[PDB]
Amino acid sequence: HENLYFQGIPRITIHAFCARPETAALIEKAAADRRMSRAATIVRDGGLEAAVDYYQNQPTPSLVMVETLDGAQRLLHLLDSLAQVCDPGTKVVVVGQTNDIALYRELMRRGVSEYLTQPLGPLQVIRAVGALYA
């Protein structure tokens, strides 16, 4: 992914449910980039667990970004619960700290759009979002 996205990201709604302060700060930095000004990005706390609870009653936005502190097994179980309340058209991006192919393969098989491994830079987040609509 070399694209600089001069045309910016399209008009979408992004809900990011972070579990780590470094991830929340990174997504807020990416959301403040001029290329992201048509995206309405809301950063929320409580990670993937809060995301599953949030969407029991609210519809999902264009893009849901999630993170968990609890490990691969808990992440996959919670993604099954999230999939039950995901609307058509919603994309899911996972932010994790583990560089593991077995996890990555499983997420891709489940239909997760992208898996981002921290440490990341804001341009990497912009390119990940941009690539989903290219």
CATH of the domain at 94: 3.40.50.2300
Secondary structure (3-state) at 80: helix
Experimental determination technique: X-ray
**Listed residue (131, 129, 115, 106) closest to 48, CA to CA:** 115
Largest CA distance in the chain: 39
Q: How many other β-carbons are positioned within 10 Å of the β-carbon of residue 39?
A: 21
The structural domain count of the chain equals 1
Own/partner long-range contacts of 68-75 (Cβ < 8 Å, ≥24 apart)? 68/19, 68/96, 69/19, 69/20, 72/98, 72/100, 72/103, 75/48, 75/103
Spatial strand order of the sheet with 40-44 comes to: 40-44, 13-17, 63-66, 91-96, 114-117
Resolution, in Å, please?
1.8
Angle formed at CA 118 by CA 112 and CA 124, multiple of 5 degrees: 75
In whole angstroms, give the CA distance from residue 96 to residue 105.
14
3-class secondary structure, 90: coil
What is the C-alpha separation between 19 and 68, in angstroms, rounded? Answer: 6
Domain that holds residue 53: 1-134
Do 24 and 15 form a contact (C-beta atoms < 8 A)? no
Query: H helices within 21-117, ranges in order?
Result: 21-31, 47-54, 72-83, 101-109
Cα separations in angstroms, 127 against 17, 33, 62, 116, 122: 19, 12, 16, 11, 9
Q: Which two tokens stand for residue 113?
A: 């759009």
